[PDB]
Amino acid sequence: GEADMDFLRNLFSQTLSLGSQKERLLDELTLEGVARYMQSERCRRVICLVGAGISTSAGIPDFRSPHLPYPEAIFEISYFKKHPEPFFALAKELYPGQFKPTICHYFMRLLKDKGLLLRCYTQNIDTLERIAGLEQEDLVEAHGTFYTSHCVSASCRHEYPLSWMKEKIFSEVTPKCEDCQSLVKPDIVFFGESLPARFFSCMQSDFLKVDLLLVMGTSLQVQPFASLISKAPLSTPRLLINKEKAYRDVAWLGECDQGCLALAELLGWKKELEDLVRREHASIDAQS
Ligand SMILES: NC(=O)c1ccccc1Nc1cccc(OCCc2ccccc2)c1
Ligand SMILES: [Zn+2]
């Protein structure tokens, strides 16, 4: 009761000092304020921007981590169209023994299920967002993905699923297009290739009406998202969940999974989320 009054005193004092130009929508710069903000009528659109940190607990590191000219050519598109073998050998070595999304991936599934997710911008090619159930339209796979692959020939472009590529990779035979006999390349954005065009219209408009940015497993100031993030309105709250003046920023520094759990609990979804995760994990265990 005196705490409720103190809560108002702090809110009034922090907004008074902010001053004249900036607008603060969070009633408190905490995970709690963010939960209340996302449970309010103002929060209709949420965009998640995620990186590697949300996959560490699922055991899949970024693959760029540590006769071929320089080490990097294995990541270059033109070197790939001429010498595909090195890449596919590495792809075999690094192929994940499992695809089990994390609590954080499923938290995003809840956002989508509750009609709250405008889009999930990801730097991961690991495919977990799709396994957790996010669809093509909910995503902008910025470094591309190994989920699908295509024939390199412009007048063919035959698509192939992971099933088909996995088999090739472990058999150590170079994937060829059944129709045009041309190479079949994973839809990863190789060095030299570019982010596909339709994603630009997302970037150019999604950030205009976003009500909340959830940045997880990657940092706020690092390019390239930093530039995507800077297109959001200045009043747009941003919650950062990553391992290691302010009026519209809140930070949860710790493991991405524990963070999504604390937020889900504050929203009363903890149980529903832990149920989704147990279920899918068993449902994935029974496929293989
Ligand atoms: N962003 C990247 O990691 C990347 C960028 C350009 C070129 C290659 C890249 N990744 C890469 C390069 C070599 C092998 C590899 O591992 C592939 C295994 C895999 C990928 C995605 C899903 C499941 C398995 C990934
Ligand atoms: Zn083809």
Author numbering: 34 to 99, 111 to 288, 313 to 356
Manuscript text:
Sirtuin 2 (SIRT2), a member of the NAD+-dependent histone deacetylase family, has recently received increasing attention due to its potential involvement in neurodegenerative diseases and the progression of cancer. Human sirtuins (SIRT1–7) are currently the only known class of histone deacetylases that require NAD+ to catalyze the selective deacetylation of lysine in histone and non-histone proteins. The catalytic region of sirtuins consists of a Rossmann-fold domain, a zinc-binding domain and the loops connecting them. The interface between the loops and the two domains form both NAD+ (subdivided by the pockets A–C) and Ac-Lys substrate-binding sites.
Herein, with the aim to elucidate the binding mode of this prototype and to further improve the inhibitory activity, we initially solved the single-crystal X-ray diffraction structure of SIRT2 in complex with 3′-phenethyloxy-2-anilinobenzamide, which revealed that 6 is located in the selectivity pocket. The inhibitor binds to a highly lipophilic pocket localized at the interface between the Rossmann-fold domain and a small domain adjacent to the C-pocket of the NAD+-binding site. The binding mode analysis of 6 revealed that its phenoxyethylphenyl moiety is surrounded by Phe131, Leu134, Leu138, Tyr139, Pro140, Phe143 and Ile169, which leads to the establishment of π–π and H–π interactions. The 2-aminobenzamide moiety oriented towards the acetyl–lysine tunnel exhibits hydrogen bonds with water molecules HOH3, HOH4 and HOH11. Of these three water molecules, HOH3 and HOH4 are stabilized by a hydrogen bond network with the side chain of the catalytically active His187 and the main chain of Val233, i.e., the key amino acid residues that stabilize the binding of the acetyl–lysine substrate during the deacetylation reaction. Closer evaluation of the superimposed SIRT2 structures revealed that the amide group of 6 might occupy the same space as the methyl group of the N ε-acetyl–lysine substrate. This result prompted us to take a new perspective toward targeting the substrate-binding site through the functionalization of the benzamide moiety in 6 to mimic the acetyl–lysine interactions, which afforded compounds 17–19, 26–28, 36, 41 and 42. In the field of SIRT2 inhibitor design, a milestone on the elucidation of the mechanism behind the isotype selectivity of SIRT2 inhibitors has recently been reported by Rumpf et al., who discovered that the novel drug-like small molecule SirReal2 (5)32,33 is able to induce a rearrangement of the SIRT2 active site by creating a binding pocket, called the “selectivity pocket”, which is responsible for isoform specificity, suggesting a potential common mode of action for selective SIRT2 inhibitors. In fact, the “selectivity pocket” is the pocket that accommodates the long chain fatty acyl groups. In this study, the binding mode of 6 on SIRT2 was elucidated using X-ray crystallography.
